Amino acid sequence: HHHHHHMLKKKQLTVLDLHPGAGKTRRVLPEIVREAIKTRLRTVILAPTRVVAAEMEEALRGLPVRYMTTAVNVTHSGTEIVDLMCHATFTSRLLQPIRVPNYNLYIMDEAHFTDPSSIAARGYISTRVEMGEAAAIFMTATPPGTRDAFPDSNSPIMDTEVEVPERAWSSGFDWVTDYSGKTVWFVPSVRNGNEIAACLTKAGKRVIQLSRKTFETEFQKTKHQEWDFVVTTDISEMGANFKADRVIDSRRCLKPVILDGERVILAGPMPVTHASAAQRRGRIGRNPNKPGDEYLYGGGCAETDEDHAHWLEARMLLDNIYLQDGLIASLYRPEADKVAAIEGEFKLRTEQRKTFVELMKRGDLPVWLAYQVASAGITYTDRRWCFDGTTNNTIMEDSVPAEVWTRHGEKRVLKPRWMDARVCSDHAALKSFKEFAAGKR
Ligand SMILES: Nc1ncnc2c1ncn2[C@@H]1O[C@H](COP(=O)(O)OP(=O)(O)O)[C@@H](O)[C@H]1O
Ligand code: BEF
Ligand SMILES: [Mn+2]
């Protein structure tokens, strides 16, 4: 009930870069949506995750918003001119035949998200603005290329550089376990998080683990049950709210890297960006009444992340989104220097584009891998490629060849024609890929 008037300018992109916890998501977003409604601007709100989409409903209760996500179960009047969906849904719809409205205003929250669908959505939106067809607001405390890892916070934070373990320990890290508060611990990989979580559990701690595959289900447990540690990958940088007193940050993670144009490996761990570091630290210091919060960090930051597969993968997506005849959207300008590709090199014809989309949406394949399969002319249900690669593409778990009973009634060793380490980097990813290779997804 203290609305501040925003003069929403046509043909403009604004970056709302207030510090973490300043109220972008909970205060400024509703104000903008009210102005958009008042002035009758057809508007889309882009949430990074289903978890945040649900929370945005609380902030927007009593405003006419169409929630285009099963994460919210609200009765729609059919008259709403504001739509809410996830970054990934927005990009996926753009790749499909499905008509996406030509919105007058795009509001992307947690616009730092570097998953390929988010990077692509930013390119599309910025292109629409540059063409004079729409306005946009990108909300993030950490715009592309920030070099500040220690922004302002609602309460003071105690910043300390320490040695952070990335393996189980039996001594040398008493400060981790001799602590009666609640800790969010950012780890370099799902497997390292499993090992640390087991160590913590053996030491009597209650641990919840979060990764992209599990986030949308395990995050609820952080609200609804008692815990001592959350052990999380980078997915928790995207507007994740914890009632926590301490963050432990390894400051590095495994990175997918395309090697010689022919395979994806997981390299590193390599340092995180300043943006990632500031978002990780930004999970604490958020309560103005609580002055004790600590950030313990394990090394430096770097901006040398052009080796990351996500940039090229964003181009694969954008190349397959229609704007106008002959026009391919560039990445948003601050990100466009991250990748050297020819605009349109990854454009697919209609049937192959359909396969590319289905491999990602229903197959849950990484963008790069989905592209290799689709561009080879393979149809979605034809899994022969999972078995006919070279011998060095053999997938191992527990030091033995992963084996599958195939749709054609043979026990076969998983040996994909194209190797993307993301499909076999932890037990759960591998299980899903084995199902896929069996024709049982
Ligand atoms: N359910 C809640 N009730 C009350 N305050 C909350 C709730 N969730 C978050 N907050 C607080 O609201 C403030 C603004 O949060 P938010 O808008 O999410 O920040 P930003 O998007 O700027 O990072 C912060 O102090 C945050 O901790
Ligand atoms: F910048 Be807030 F943490 F979304
Ligand atoms: Mn936010």
Short mmCIF file of C-alpha atoms and ligand atoms in Angstrom, two decimals:
data_model
loop_
_atom_site.label_atom_id
_atom_site.label_comp_id
_atom_site.label_asym_id
_atom_site.label_seq_id
_atom_site.Cartn_x
_atom_site.Cartn_y
_atom_site.Cartn_z
CA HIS A 1 0.00 0.00 0.00
CA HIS A 2 2.98 2.29 -0.64
CA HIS A 3 3.07 2.08 -4.40
CA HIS A 4 5.87 4.01 -6.17
CA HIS A 5 5.01 5.16 -9.70
CA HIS A 6 7.27 3.67 -12.42
CA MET A 7 7.11 5.48 -15.76
CA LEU A 8 7.44 2.36 -17.96
CA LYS A 9 9.11 3.63 -21.14
CA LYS A 10 8.36 2.04 -24.50
CA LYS A 11 11.32 0.58 -26.48
CA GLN A 12 13.61 0.46 -23.43
CA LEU A 13 15.49 -2.17 -21.36
CA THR A 14 16.09 -1.43 -17.70
CA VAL A 15 18.34 -3.42 -15.40
CA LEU A 16 17.07 -3.31 -11.82
CA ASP A 17 20.27 -4.10 -9.85
CA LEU A 18 19.42 -3.39 -6.25
CA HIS A 19 21.55 -5.43 -3.81
CA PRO A 20 20.42 -8.89 -2.63
CA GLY A 21 17.45 -8.69 -0.24
CA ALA A 22 16.61 -5.10 -1.21
CA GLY A 23 13.09 -6.17 -2.35
CA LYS A 24 13.20 -6.58 -6.11
CA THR A 25 11.20 -9.80 -6.09
CA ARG A 26 8.81 -8.96 -3.19
CA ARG A 27 8.30 -5.16 -3.47
CA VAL A 28 9.32 -3.78 -6.84
CA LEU A 29 7.87 -6.58 -8.98
CA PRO A 30 4.28 -6.14 -7.69
CA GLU A 31 4.61 -2.36 -8.22
CA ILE A 32 5.62 -2.85 -11.79
CA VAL A 33 2.84 -5.37 -12.37
CA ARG A 34 0.25 -2.88 -10.92
CA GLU A 35 1.52 -0.15 -13.28
CA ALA A 36 1.42 -2.58 -16.19
CA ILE A 37 -2.19 -3.51 -15.34
CA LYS A 38 -3.24 0.18 -14.83
CA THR A 39 -1.78 1.10 -18.16
CA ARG A 40 -3.05 -2.12 -19.96
CA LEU A 41 0.37 -3.45 -21.09
CA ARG A 42 0.35 -7.13 -22.06
CA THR A 43 3.06 -8.44 -19.77
CA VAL A 44 4.99 -11.63 -19.06
CA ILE A 45 6.77 -12.28 -15.76
CA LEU A 46 9.62 -14.82 -16.03
CA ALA A 47 10.51 -16.77 -12.88
CA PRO A 48 13.79 -18.81 -12.79
CA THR A 49 12.17 -21.91 -11.17
CA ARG A 50 8.73 -23.35 -10.29
CA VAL A 51 9.58 -22.80 -6.62
CA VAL A 52 9.94 -19.05 -7.20
CA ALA A 53 6.86 -18.96 -9.46
CA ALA A 54 4.84 -20.32 -6.50
CA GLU A 55 6.32 -17.76 -4.13
CA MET A 56 5.63 -14.94 -6.59
CA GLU A 57 1.90 -15.92 -6.31
CA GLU A 58 2.07 -14.91 -2.60
CA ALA A 59 3.58 -11.53 -3.53
CA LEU A 60 0.99 -11.02 -6.30
CA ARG A 61 -2.13 -12.31 -4.48
CA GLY A 62 -5.15 -10.23 -5.53
CA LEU A 63 -3.59 -9.09 -8.82
CA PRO A 64 -5.04 -10.59 -12.03
CA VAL A 65 -2.14 -12.81 -13.18
CA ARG A 66 -2.35 -15.89 -15.42
CA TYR A 67 -0.03 -18.57 -13.99
CA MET A 68 1.23 -20.74 -16.80
CA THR A 69 2.77 -23.33 -14.57
CA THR A 70 1.34 -26.30 -12.68
CA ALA A 71 3.34 -25.02 -9.64
CA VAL A 72 0.44 -22.63 -8.89
CA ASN A 73 -3.18 -23.88 -8.69
CA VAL A 74 -5.07 -20.56 -9.03
CA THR A 75 -8.52 -20.10 -10.70
CA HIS A 76 -8.08 -17.85 -13.79
CA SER A 77 -10.91 -15.50 -14.84
CA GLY A 78 -9.77 -15.57 -18.50
CA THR A 79 -9.33 -11.73 -18.47
CA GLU A 80 -5.77 -11.43 -17.09
CA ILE A 81 -3.25 -9.53 -19.26
CA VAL A 82 -0.20 -10.52 -17.18
CA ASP A 83 1.24 -14.03 -17.65
CA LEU A 84 3.70 -15.77 -15.35
CA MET A 85 5.92 -18.63 -16.47
CA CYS A 86 9.41 -20.03 -15.93
CA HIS A 87 12.40 -18.88 -18.03
CA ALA A 88 12.64 -22.37 -19.53
CA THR A 89 8.91 -22.60 -20.45
CA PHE A 90 9.06 -19.23 -22.21
CA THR A 91 12.02 -20.35 -24.38
CA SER A 92 10.52 -23.80 -25.01
CA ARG A 93 7.21 -22.25 -26.19
CA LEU A 94 9.17 -19.99 -28.53
CA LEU A 95 10.81 -23.02 -30.12
CA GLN A 96 7.42 -24.74 -30.62
CA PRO A 97 4.55 -23.86 -33.05
CA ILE A 98 2.48 -22.61 -30.11
CA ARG A 99 1.75 -18.87 -30.50
CA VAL A 100 3.54 -16.88 -27.73
CA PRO A 101 2.01 -13.47 -27.37
CA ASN A 102 3.92 -10.42 -28.55
CA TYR A 103 4.17 -8.97 -25.04
CA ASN A 104 4.65 -5.19 -24.64
CA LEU A 105 6.63 -5.71 -21.40
CA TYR A 106 8.97 -8.55 -20.41
CA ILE A 107 9.95 -8.75 -16.76
CA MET A 108 12.71 -11.27 -16.08
CA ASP A 109 13.41 -11.96 -12.47
CA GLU A 110 16.75 -13.47 -11.39
CA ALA A 111 18.04 -12.39 -14.80
CA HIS A 112 21.51 -13.56 -13.88
CA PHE A 113 20.47 -17.23 -14.46
CA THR A 114 23.02 -18.70 -16.90
CA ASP A 115 21.18 -21.84 -17.97
CA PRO A 116 20.97 -21.86 -21.75
CA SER A 117 17.17 -21.28 -21.84
CA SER A 118 17.62 -18.12 -19.71
CA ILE A 119 20.53 -16.80 -21.79
CA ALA A 120 18.41 -17.40 -24.92
CA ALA A 121 15.35 -15.71 -23.42
CA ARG A 122 17.50 -12.63 -22.66
CA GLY A 123 18.72 -12.54 -26.30
CA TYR A 124 15.19 -12.76 -27.67
CA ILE A 125 13.83 -10.13 -25.31
CA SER A 126 16.70 -7.69 -25.81
CA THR A 127 16.34 -8.11 -29.58
CA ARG A 128 12.60 -7.31 -29.41
CA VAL A 129 13.47 -4.13 -27.40
CA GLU A 130 16.27 -3.14 -29.76
CA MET A 131 13.81 -3.49 -32.70
CA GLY A 132 11.53 -1.00 -30.90
CA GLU A 133 8.72 -3.53 -30.36
CA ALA A 134 8.66 -3.90 -26.57
CA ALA A 135 10.07 -2.82 -23.23
CA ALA A 136 11.85 -5.05 -20.69
CA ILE A 137 13.05 -5.13 -17.14
CA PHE A 138 15.87 -7.50 -16.10
CA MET A 139 15.93 -7.87 -12.32
CA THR A 140 19.10 -9.06 -10.71
CA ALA A 141 21.51 -8.00 -8.05
CA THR A 142 24.33 -9.32 -10.28
CA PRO A 143 24.11 -8.18 -13.89
CA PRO A 144 26.35 -9.87 -16.51
CA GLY A 145 30.02 -9.19 -15.88
CA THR A 146 29.73 -7.79 -12.32
CA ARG A 147 33.10 -7.84 -10.55
CA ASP A 148 31.66 -7.24 -7.08
CA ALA A 149 31.47 -10.47 -4.98
CA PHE A 150 30.58 -8.52 -1.80
CA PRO A 151 27.57 -6.27 -2.41
CA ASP A 152 25.45 -4.56 0.25
CA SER A 153 23.13 -6.66 2.41
CA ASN A 154 20.23 -5.98 4.83
CA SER A 155 22.41 -6.91 7.81
CA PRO A 156 26.20 -7.05 8.22
CA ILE A 157 27.90 -10.24 7.07
CA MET A 158 31.12 -11.62 8.44
CA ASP A 159 33.27 -12.55 5.39
CA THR A 160 36.12 -15.02 6.05
CA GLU A 161 38.40 -16.88 3.61
CA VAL A 162 38.97 -20.44 4.82
CA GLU A 163 39.97 -23.83 3.49
CA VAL A 164 36.68 -25.46 2.57
CA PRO A 165 36.62 -29.27 2.33
CA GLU A 166 35.52 -30.93 -0.94
CA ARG A 167 35.81 -34.49 0.40
CA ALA A 168 34.82 -36.28 3.64
CA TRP A 169 37.11 -35.51 6.55
CA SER A 170 37.90 -37.11 9.91
CA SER A 171 39.78 -34.04 11.34
CA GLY A 172 40.90 -30.51 10.56
CA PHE A 173 37.47 -28.85 10.07
CA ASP A 174 35.98 -28.59 13.57
CA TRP A 175 34.48 -25.16 12.73
CA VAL A 176 32.10 -26.82 10.26
CA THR A 177 30.50 -29.24 12.78
CA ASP A 178 31.07 -27.17 16.02
CA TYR A 179 28.32 -24.77 14.96
CA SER A 180 24.75 -24.59 16.24
CA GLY A 181 23.24 -22.52 13.41
CA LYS A 182 21.94 -23.52 9.99
CA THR A 183 24.34 -23.67 7.04
CA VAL A 184 23.85 -23.56 3.27
CA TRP A 185 26.92 -25.08 1.66
CA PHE A 186 27.60 -24.60 -2.06
CA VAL A 187 29.60 -27.58 -3.43
CA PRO A 188 31.45 -28.09 -6.74
CA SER A 189 29.32 -31.08 -7.96
CA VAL A 190 26.47 -33.42 -7.10
CA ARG A 191 28.97 -36.26 -6.31
CA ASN A 192 31.08 -34.04 -4.01
CA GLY A 193 27.84 -32.91 -2.27
CA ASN A 194 26.89 -36.58 -1.73
CA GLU A 195 30.22 -37.29 -0.06
CA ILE A 196 30.08 -34.17 2.15
CA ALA A 197 26.43 -34.84 3.07
CA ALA A 198 27.33 -38.43 4.12
CA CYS A 199 30.16 -37.06 6.28
CA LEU A 200 27.84 -34.55 7.91
CA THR A 201 25.15 -37.20 8.47
CA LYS A 202 27.72 -39.53 10.11
CA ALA A 203 28.59 -36.58 12.38
CA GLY A 204 24.94 -36.41 13.48
CA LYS A 205 23.74 -33.56 11.26
CA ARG A 206 20.43 -33.31 9.39
CA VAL A 207 21.20 -32.62 5.70
CA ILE A 208 19.04 -31.78 2.67
CA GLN A 209 20.71 -31.97 -0.78
CA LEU A 210 19.67 -29.77 -3.71
CA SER A 211 20.56 -30.01 -7.42
CA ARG A 212 18.76 -29.02 -10.66
CA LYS A 213 17.25 -32.51 -11.04
CA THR A 214 15.87 -32.49 -7.46
CA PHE A 215 15.40 -28.80 -6.67
CA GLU A 216 11.71 -28.41 -7.44
CA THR A 217 10.88 -31.31 -4.96
CA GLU A 218 13.66 -31.18 -2.27
CA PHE A 219 13.53 -27.40 -1.77
CA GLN A 220 10.02 -27.71 -0.18
CA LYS A 221 11.65 -29.87 2.54
CA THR A 222 13.84 -26.91 3.53
CA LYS A 223 10.65 -24.97 4.37
CA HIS A 224 8.74 -27.92 5.84
CA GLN A 225 11.22 -30.01 7.93
CA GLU A 226 14.11 -29.39 10.37
CA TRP A 227 17.67 -29.21 8.99
CA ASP A 228 21.24 -28.34 9.98
CA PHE A 229 22.84 -28.15 6.50
CA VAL A 230 21.58 -27.60 2.97
CA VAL A 231 24.22 -28.96 0.57
CA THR A 232 23.53 -27.40 -2.85
CA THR A 233 24.89 -26.87 -6.33
CA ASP A 234 24.68 -23.46 -8.06
CA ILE A 235 20.87 -23.80 -8.69
CA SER A 236 20.30 -22.14 -5.30
CA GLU A 237 21.71 -18.82 -6.66
CA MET A 238 18.38 -18.04 -8.36
CA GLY A 239 16.23 -16.31 -5.69
CA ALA A 240 16.36 -19.21 -3.20
CA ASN A 241 15.14 -18.23 0.28
CA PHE A 242 16.59 -20.09 3.30
CA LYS A 243 16.29 -19.23 7.00
CA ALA A 244 20.00 -19.70 7.37
CA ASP A 245 22.78 -18.19 9.54
CA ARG A 246 25.86 -19.24 7.55
CA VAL A 247 27.00 -19.95 4.01
CA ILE A 248 29.99 -22.09 3.18
CA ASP A 249 31.14 -21.57 -0.41
CA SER A 250 33.80 -23.70 -2.13
CA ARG A 251 33.90 -20.86 -4.78
CA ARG A 252 34.39 -23.38 -7.57
CA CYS A 253 32.46 -25.89 -9.56
CA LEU A 254 32.61 -28.38 -12.42
CA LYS A 255 31.91 -26.75 -15.78
CA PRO A 256 30.61 -28.44 -19.02
CA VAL A 257 33.08 -27.74 -21.85
CA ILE A 258 32.73 -28.74 -25.52
CA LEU A 259 36.02 -30.41 -26.53
CA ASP A 260 36.99 -30.16 -30.22
CA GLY A 261 33.37 -29.63 -31.25
CA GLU A 262 32.77 -33.35 -30.64
CA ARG A 263 32.13 -34.11 -26.96
CA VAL A 264 31.20 -32.48 -23.68
CA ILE A 265 33.33 -33.06 -20.61
CA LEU A 266 32.97 -31.80 -17.06
CA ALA A 267 36.09 -29.78 -16.38
CA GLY A 268 37.60 -28.43 -13.17
CA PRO A 269 36.42 -27.60 -10.60
CA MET A 270 37.04 -24.05 -11.80
CA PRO A 271 36.39 -20.76 -10.00
CA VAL A 272 32.93 -19.28 -10.00
CA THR A 273 32.14 -15.84 -11.32
CA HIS A 274 31.84 -12.81 -9.04
CA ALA A 275 28.09 -12.84 -9.79
CA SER A 276 27.82 -16.45 -8.53
CA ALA A 277 29.90 -15.68 -5.44
CA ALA A 278 27.71 -12.58 -4.58
CA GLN A 279 24.51 -14.61 -5.05
CA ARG A 280 25.82 -17.42 -2.82
CA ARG A 281 26.84 -14.99 -0.07
CA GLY A 282 23.56 -13.15 -0.75
CA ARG A 283 21.56 -16.05 0.67
CA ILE A 284 22.47 -14.76 4.19
CA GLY A 285 22.53 -11.32 5.78
CA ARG A 286 18.98 -10.91 4.52
CA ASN A 287 17.12 -10.31 7.81
CA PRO A 288 17.67 -6.73 9.09
CA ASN A 289 17.05 -7.90 12.72
CA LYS A 290 19.70 -10.66 12.59
CA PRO A 291 23.28 -9.27 12.57
CA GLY A 292 25.32 -12.48 13.11
CA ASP A 293 25.46 -14.14 9.60
CA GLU A 294 28.71 -15.56 8.21
CA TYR A 295 30.08 -16.23 4.73
CA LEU A 296 33.02 -18.64 4.64
CA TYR A 297 34.61 -18.93 1.26
CA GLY A 298 37.24 -21.20 -0.17
CA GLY A 299 39.07 -19.37 -2.97
CA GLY A 300 38.84 -16.71 -5.64
CA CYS A 301 36.50 -15.75 -8.46
CA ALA A 302 37.15 -15.54 -12.18
CA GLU A 303 35.28 -14.18 -15.25
CA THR A 304 37.04 -16.44 -17.75
CA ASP A 305 33.99 -18.62 -18.39
CA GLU A 306 33.85 -18.55 -22.21
CA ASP A 307 34.78 -22.26 -22.11
CA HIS A 308 31.31 -22.94 -20.59
CA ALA A 309 29.04 -24.89 -22.91
CA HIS A 310 25.94 -22.84 -21.96
CA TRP A 311 26.89 -19.91 -24.21
CA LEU A 312 27.01 -21.98 -27.39
CA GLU A 313 23.95 -23.93 -26.27
CA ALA A 314 22.08 -20.59 -25.94
CA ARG A 315 22.96 -19.92 -29.61
CA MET A 316 21.60 -23.36 -30.60
CA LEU A 317 18.29 -22.41 -29.05
CA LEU A 318 18.17 -18.80 -30.39
CA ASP A 319 18.99 -19.98 -33.92
CA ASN A 320 15.75 -21.99 -33.78
CA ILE A 321 13.47 -19.19 -32.59
CA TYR A 322 11.59 -17.15 -35.23
CA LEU A 323 11.41 -13.36 -34.92
CA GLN A 324 10.99 -11.97 -38.43
CA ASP A 325 12.23 -13.26 -41.83
CA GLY A 326 16.06 -13.43 -41.91
CA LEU A 327 16.41 -12.04 -38.37
CA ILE A 328 18.17 -14.15 -35.76
CA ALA A 329 18.35 -12.64 -32.28
CA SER A 330 21.79 -11.92 -30.86
CA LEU A 331 22.49 -12.69 -27.23
CA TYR A 332 21.92 -9.78 -24.87
CA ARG A 333 24.90 -7.43 -25.47
CA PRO A 334 26.93 -7.95 -22.25
CA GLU A 335 26.81 -11.74 -22.91
CA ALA A 336 27.33 -11.68 -26.67
CA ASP A 337 31.14 -11.48 -26.26
CA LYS A 338 31.05 -14.87 -24.42
CA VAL A 339 30.67 -16.90 -27.61
CA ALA A 340 32.04 -16.78 -31.14
CA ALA A 341 29.49 -18.45 -33.39
CA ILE A 342 27.89 -17.55 -36.70
CA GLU A 343 24.30 -16.44 -36.17
CA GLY A 344 22.04 -19.10 -37.67
CA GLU A 345 24.63 -21.88 -37.94
CA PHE A 346 22.46 -24.08 -35.74
CA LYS A 347 19.15 -23.36 -37.48
CA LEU A 348 17.23 -26.62 -38.10
CA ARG A 349 14.47 -27.40 -40.61
CA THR A 350 10.98 -27.94 -39.22
CA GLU A 351 10.97 -31.70 -38.50
CA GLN A 352 14.50 -31.70 -37.06
CA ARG A 353 13.62 -28.66 -34.90
CA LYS A 354 10.64 -30.67 -33.56
CA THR A 355 12.96 -33.52 -32.66
CA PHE A 356 15.44 -31.11 -31.04
CA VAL A 357 12.63 -29.70 -28.88
CA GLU A 358 11.22 -33.13 -27.90
CA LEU A 359 14.73 -34.46 -26.99
CA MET A 360 15.17 -31.59 -24.55
CA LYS A 361 11.60 -31.33 -23.17
CA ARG A 362 10.65 -35.03 -22.95
CA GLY A 363 14.05 -36.68 -23.22
CA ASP A 364 15.64 -34.26 -20.74
CA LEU A 365 18.83 -34.25 -22.83
CA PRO A 366 21.32 -31.35 -22.58
CA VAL A 367 20.90 -28.83 -25.41
CA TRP A 368 24.28 -29.76 -27.06
CA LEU A 369 23.44 -33.49 -27.11
CA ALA A 370 19.86 -32.94 -28.33
CA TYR A 371 21.26 -30.82 -31.15
CA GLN A 372 23.73 -33.54 -32.28
CA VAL A 373 20.97 -36.10 -32.46
CA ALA A 374 18.37 -33.85 -34.12
CA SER A 375 20.80 -32.45 -36.70
CA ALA A 376 21.83 -36.01 -37.67
CA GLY A 377 18.20 -36.63 -38.79
CA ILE A 378 17.43 -39.11 -36.04
CA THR A 379 13.81 -39.25 -34.80
CA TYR A 380 12.96 -38.92 -31.12
CA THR A 381 12.09 -42.60 -30.46
CA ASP A 382 15.12 -44.06 -32.34
CA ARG A 383 17.64 -44.93 -29.60
CA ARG A 384 20.16 -46.85 -31.76
CA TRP A 385 22.64 -43.96 -31.33
CA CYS A 386 22.89 -44.71 -27.63
CA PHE A 387 24.68 -47.99 -28.46
CA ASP A 388 26.66 -47.44 -31.67
CA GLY A 389 29.43 -45.04 -30.64
CA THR A 390 33.17 -45.68 -30.40
CA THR A 391 34.55 -47.83 -27.56
CA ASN A 392 35.95 -44.86 -25.62
CA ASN A 393 32.36 -43.46 -25.35
CA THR A 394 31.45 -46.50 -23.15
CA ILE A 395 29.69 -45.31 -20.03
CA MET A 396 30.89 -46.69 -16.70
CA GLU A 397 29.30 -46.78 -13.26
CA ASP A 398 31.05 -48.32 -10.22
CA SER A 399 34.00 -49.14 -12.58
CA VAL A 400 31.85 -51.45 -14.81
CA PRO A 401 30.09 -50.77 -18.19
CA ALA A 402 26.54 -49.49 -17.85
CA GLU A 403 24.28 -52.02 -19.51
CA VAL A 404 20.68 -51.81 -20.63
CA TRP A 405 18.01 -54.20 -21.88
CA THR A 406 17.03 -52.48 -25.14
CA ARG A 407 13.72 -52.13 -26.90
CA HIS A 408 14.99 -54.68 -29.45
CA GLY A 409 15.59 -57.41 -26.81
CA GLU A 410 19.33 -57.35 -26.25
CA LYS A 411 21.47 -56.60 -23.22
CA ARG A 412 23.68 -53.83 -24.54
CA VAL A 413 26.46 -51.69 -23.18
CA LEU A 414 25.70 -47.97 -23.17
CA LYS A 415 28.05 -46.45 -25.75
CA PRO A 416 26.60 -43.26 -27.19
CA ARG A 417 27.54 -41.96 -30.58
CA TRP A 418 27.94 -38.53 -28.94
CA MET A 419 29.29 -38.26 -25.38
CA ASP A 420 27.94 -35.55 -23.06
CA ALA A 421 29.29 -36.11 -19.56
CA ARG A 422 26.18 -34.44 -18.10
CA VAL A 423 24.10 -37.58 -18.80
CA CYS A 424 26.35 -39.78 -16.63
CA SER A 425 27.88 -37.43 -14.01
CA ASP A 426 25.97 -38.81 -11.02
CA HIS A 427 23.85 -41.85 -10.21
CA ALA A 428 20.50 -40.12 -10.92
CA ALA A 429 21.51 -38.59 -14.25
CA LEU A 430 22.81 -41.96 -15.34
CA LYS A 431 19.64 -43.81 -14.28
CA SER A 432 17.56 -41.37 -16.35
CA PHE A 433 19.83 -41.83 -19.35
CA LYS A 434 19.65 -45.63 -19.05
CA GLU A 435 15.84 -45.38 -19.07
CA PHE A 436 16.04 -43.14 -22.15
CA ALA A 437 18.40 -45.53 -23.90
CA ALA A 438 15.96 -48.40 -23.09
CA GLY A 439 13.04 -46.54 -24.74
CA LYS A 440 11.40 -46.43 -21.27
CA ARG A 441 11.12 -42.68 -20.72
N1 LIG B 1 7.84 -14.82 3.29
C1 LIG B 1 8.56 -13.77 3.68
N2 LIG B 1 8.07 -12.98 4.67
C2 LIG B 1 8.75 -11.88 5.02
N3 LIG B 1 9.89 -11.41 4.52
C3 LIG B 1 10.36 -12.22 3.56
C4 LIG B 1 9.78 -13.39 3.09
N4 LIG B 1 10.56 -13.97 2.10
C5 LIG B 1 11.57 -13.15 1.99
N5 LIG B 1 11.52 -12.06 2.83
C6 LIG B 1 12.43 -10.93 2.93
O1 LIG B 1 11.95 -9.89 2.10
C7 LIG B 1 13.07 -9.02 1.77
C8 LIG B 1 13.06 -8.77 0.29
O2 LIG B 1 13.24 -10.05 -0.37
P1 LIG B 1 13.35 -10.14 -2.00
O3 LIG B 1 12.38 -9.28 -2.71
O4 LIG B 1 13.20 -11.62 -2.29
O5 LIG B 1 14.79 -9.56 -2.33
P2 LIG B 1 15.51 -9.46 -3.75
O6 LIG B 1 14.68 -10.06 -4.87
O7 LIG B 1 15.84 -8.01 -3.80
O8 LIG B 1 16.77 -10.25 -3.51
C9 LIG B 1 14.32 -9.73 2.31
O9 LIG B 1 14.71 -9.24 3.58
C10 LIG B 1 13.85 -11.17 2.44
O10 LIG B 1 14.58 -11.91 3.39
F1 BEF B 2 18.78 -10.26 -5.36
BE1 BEF B 2 17.83 -11.18 -4.55
F2 BEF B 2 18.66 -12.17 -3.66
F3 BEF B 2 16.92 -11.97 -5.51
MN MN B 3 14.97 -11.68 -6.08
#
